Amino acid sequence: LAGLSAALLRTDSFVGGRWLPAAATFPVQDPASGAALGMVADCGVREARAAVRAAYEAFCRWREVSAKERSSLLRKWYNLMIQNKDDLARIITAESGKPLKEAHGEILYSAFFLEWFSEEARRVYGDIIHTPAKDRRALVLKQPIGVAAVITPWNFPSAMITRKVGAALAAGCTVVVKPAEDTPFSALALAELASQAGIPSGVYNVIPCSRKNAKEVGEAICTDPLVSKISFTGSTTTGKILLHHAANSVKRVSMELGGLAPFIVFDSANVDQAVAGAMASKFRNTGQTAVCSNQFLVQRGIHDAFVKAFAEAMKKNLRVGNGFEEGTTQGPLINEKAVEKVEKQVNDAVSKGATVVTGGKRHQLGKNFFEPTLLCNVTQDMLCTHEETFGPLAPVIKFDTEEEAIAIANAADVGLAGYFYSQDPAQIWRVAEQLEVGMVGVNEGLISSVECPFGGVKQSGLGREGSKYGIDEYLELKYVCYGGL
Amino acid sequence: LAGLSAALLRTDSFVGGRWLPAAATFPVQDPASGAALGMVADCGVREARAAVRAAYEAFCRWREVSAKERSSLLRKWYNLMIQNKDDLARIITAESGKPLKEAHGEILYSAFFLEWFSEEARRVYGDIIHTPAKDRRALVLKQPIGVAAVITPWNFPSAMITRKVGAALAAGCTVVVKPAEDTPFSALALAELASQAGIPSGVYNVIPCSRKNAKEVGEAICTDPLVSKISFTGSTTTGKILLHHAANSVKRVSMELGGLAPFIVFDSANVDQAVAGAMASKFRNTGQTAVCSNQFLVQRGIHDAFVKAFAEAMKKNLRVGNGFEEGTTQGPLINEKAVEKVEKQVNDAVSKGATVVTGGKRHQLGKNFFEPTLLCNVTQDMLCTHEETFGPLAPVIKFDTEEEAIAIANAADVGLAGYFYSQDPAQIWRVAEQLEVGMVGVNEGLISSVECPFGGVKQSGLGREGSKYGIDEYLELKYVCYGGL
Amino acid sequence: LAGLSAALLRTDSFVGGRWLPAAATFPVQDPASGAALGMVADCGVREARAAVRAAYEAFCRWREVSAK
Amino acid sequence: NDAVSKGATVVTGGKRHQLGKNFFEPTLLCNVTQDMLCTHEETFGPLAPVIKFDTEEEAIAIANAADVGL
């Protein structure tokens, strides 16, 4: 709980290389125990504009720094994350409630994004194009957009910031981060390390704030004319609101919006593996992620064998409890509103035909704990207005044909992640290409990777993060027609 | 005027491979003579939704066609444009009023976009990425977005459509075009040729409409859930309105918004060349383009020599008249509102200190003709609310230093094209990199090219057209984590 | 005035067996001298609902405890 | 800016200082004219606008463009 590096646990906002408190503050509590973690600065529109100016002024200098130097600083920052991984992991578990093991996995992942873009910084290549005219040459330069507003969710309080910020800095941009109020510490812990690494003042800013100011501050930074880019990860409702704010000044935008995720098990699938995959993809972070398989489409032939083995795996591996407690596998839901959402989903389903296979009530520990649930006999029309209800709940929907499963999964206008298990080479390519999603897992339930492009299609988002395409979200192309030859 | 291929001059909308008239129509007149050119279908929201459905249904089939086949059709379409270039050029001159020579230049350019993307279609490459885990392989596929709404301006009634549509089709998308009401014919002439080339029904649709329905139809297609992409070129005001429409469903967007364009002449510049460049960049299409150098920043040292030689070039080469008339160099302004805008700009400037060097009144031919104007002694603060006033008018602003010229030109939040003349190797790189614009012309006043990326920074736009980056505006990345290995 | 058991003079709210501060606070002064006594947590509707839930969940267990 | 664009001639530094933040370069503009101080009567900064005059009666009349006087 404590014994942490005093420098890592922070309560003030970080702007212009300085720790600044705000007129107001907001409480942050351990989602599992309820223990007060601290009072965090509640930045208002005033503090946001100031942060933007800090970022803008830092940009005019930062963009001037050599890519080899920016690269060097991004790596020192990476090393500092690894050096402090144990304490950084505890901060995540303490505020998100996810099991320490998972938190340790996030910190590495988070650190790997800084490492990865550190390498990308020196690889922004322009082009030399041939044109008919002999009196000219065409060059294409790539330059950083400027200042970017980064708004992150609570699920992965560290990795979500690091994957956006790493790219931005590697490109030569500066950023103003607005972390989730449920988990502001991971963002400020990163700030402490950014100053230790030597990140110039104003290049990385963090302005924490609560529900009260969320709306105002969100609009302030997504509207400021000194801001030229917006990176948001969260709900579709907030996303669309920021898209309107952005529209007024034609800002560059990239976002990943919450949503469902199909998990299809075909007759030719290796049951145990499918189950292991369903286990990893559904109960990671207690089912609180946008890449969390919500609905399971399972083929008649293998249905029964699957639903049974899945349930038997849940009893064997899921241990609800406190994230710091050894052996815990399932942490608490972030808040009460969250629990109510799961209950809503479960009851609405049972009352409509669903058959609860195991645990469908609040856990005996009370508070925000919910029993990992598995319901079968679920039907497509039982997921309405629950597309953003995240919890340890797995509704299994049976199907007969492939064409059928694909049609159901593609009940789109939404499409982020998608999973499926099969042993048919031909079927694998068909489904993988036809699944209207941004990321597809084949015989795998965990697909995270800093070198691969994350994001969604249709209403699930804009742009991609990570991989060799991540840095492009923060660059502008400039065609230079060198003539007079 | 006539004697044109009856099949090329069309009046009905083109949807689902069929020519469909609308309940209403609107007149189109030769901007120079005033002659009635024809009654064109005025599509309403109903006809637009129908066109979208046509495009959507065509998409499910078109996306399935091999890239080599889509490529083949795009080229047949290109050949048909070249085969009919003379008549296609006349249609442009007849409706835009630009000189035949210029119209001939547009048709080639327009045709070259179809040719260019025809080649791009077979070159959409996915990736194979290495990841630490030995039990999996990472693949990245690129697939077409779906249906795109294409809204084009009147300036380049053909090339503006062709550069967007070529990319979309090459990527495997289908489109619904909403041409400018001042110049709908070029869009329909293309449709006739698309059917001759064998473009499948619904792949290329055109829904003409007038001011009345512009607002409604614009919203209809930029809102329809069957539409996943929007490509708009025009005013910043309409652009921002479409950005709001797009926001509601998180549509992919790419636009190029009108704006100023600096033309800097430095002391080391070759006067004659600078003048020739200023001539080409300012009076092309009679100064009616977004890439038209509006303000001229000229250094004290070479100022006088320049302003004089520029004026002497205007008298020698600019011949106002009818585009079909041999020897015409300057055509009419598109409409009265346009002329009033130029007058406004000229008078507002003179009355504020400017010195008219040559012709600053309506031309003696009357109607929409305006005398090519050149005013010196202009000052930065004389371009307010005129950033989108296009006409044959060149305001010259003197400057002392480079730092100064750059600061003035970068009075941004706007940035599309930029030009400058210099003979200093070092200065060339400095200005070219510091000019916050999307395209920079060095010792050249004409920079068009289908293999180079066009577009703007800040509020001048989103995305790029042409070149090897054009097709990316119409693709979605899909990361496939092939595991179970 | 002071020299009191630090544990007895408190400023945070008490919910679910834990001391929890609130986003806001309010001053408490000695009605006679005017001296500032301390800043006390100013609980809002959010903190109240949470306290109620704490009480409700505690009730299901407390009611079960023997009267002795 | 309102002054320069209206006729003023910046004699020295008329932009934010290179230190950024709230620093501004001490400015000195000449060729300024009385009608360039509107809605700026309470704009305080290191800025000195010089207005030329011929006679005493003139200078006094300008300075006494009162209803204000500290």
Curated annotation (Swiss-Prot), chains A, B:
Q: Which residues bind substrate?
A: R163, R284, S448
Q: Which SUPFAM superfamilies match?
A: ALDH-like
The EC code for this enzyme is 1.2.1.24
Annotated positions binding NAD(+): 152-154, 178-181, 234-239, 256, 388-390
Keyword list, A-Z: Acetylation, Disease variant, Disulfide bond, Mitochondrion, NAD, Oxidoreductase, Phosphoprotein, Transit peptide
Phenotype when changing C43F? In SSADHD; 3% of activity
Task: Kindly give the Pfam families that the UniProt entry links to this protein.
Answer: Aldedh
Q: Which domain of life is it from?
A: Eukaryota
Modified sites of kind Phosphoserine = S449
Q: What is the effect of changing G483R?
A: In SSADHD; <1% of activity
- Phenotype for H130Y: 83% of activity
What would be an example GO MF term here? Answer: identical protein binding
Which positions bear N6-acetyllysine? K76, K215, K315, K361
Q: Which cysteines are joined by disulfide bonds?
A: A290-C292
| Reaction catalysed by this enzyme | succinate semialdehyde + NAD(+) + H2O = succinate + NADH + 2 H(+)
Question: Result of mutating R163A?
Answer: Reduces catalytic activity to less than 15% of wild-type
Q: What does the record say about activity regulation?
A: Redox-regulated. Inhibited under oxydizing conditions. Inhibited by hydrogen peroxide H(2)O(2).
User: Which disease relates to this protein according to its record?
Assistant: Succinic semialdehyde dehydrogenase deficiency: A rare inborn error of 4-aminobutyric acid (GABA) metabolism, which leads to accumulation of 4-hydroxybutyric acid in physiologic fluids of patients. The disease is clinically characterized by developmental delay, hypotonia, intellectual disability, ataxia, seizures, hyperkinetic behavior, aggression, and sleep disturbances.
Report the sequence similarity comment from the record.
Belongs to the aldehyde dehydrogenase family.
State the oligomer form and interacting partners. Answer: Homotetramer.
Q: What is this protein called?
A: Succinate-semialdehyde dehydrogenase, mitochondrial
What would be the name of the gene that encodes this protein? Answer: ALDH5A1
From Swiss-Prot, chain D:
User: As annotated in Swiss-Prot or TrEMBL, what is the tissue specificity of this protein?
Assistant: Brain, pancreas, heart, liver, skeletal muscle and kidney. Lower in placenta.
Cellular compartment(s): Mitochondrion
Sites binding NAD(+) sit at E42, T43, F44
Associated disorder is: Succinic semialdehyde dehydrogenase deficiency: A rare inborn error of 4-aminobutyric acid (GABA) metabolism, which leads to accumulation of 4-hydroxybutyric acid in physiologic fluids of patients. The disease is clinically characterized by developmental delay, hypotonia, intellectual disability, ataxia, seizures, hyperkinetic behavior, aggression, and sleep disturbances.
Record note on quaternary structure: Homotetramer.
- Annotated function: Catalyzes one step in the degradation of the inhibitory neurotransmitter gamma-aminobutyric acid (GABA).
* Record family assignment: Belongs to the aldehyde dehydrogenase family.
Its protein name is Succinate-semialdehyde dehydrogenase, mitochondrial
The upper taxonomy is: Eukaryota, Metazoa, Chordata, Craniata, Vertebrata
Question: Gene encoding it?
Answer: ALDH5A1
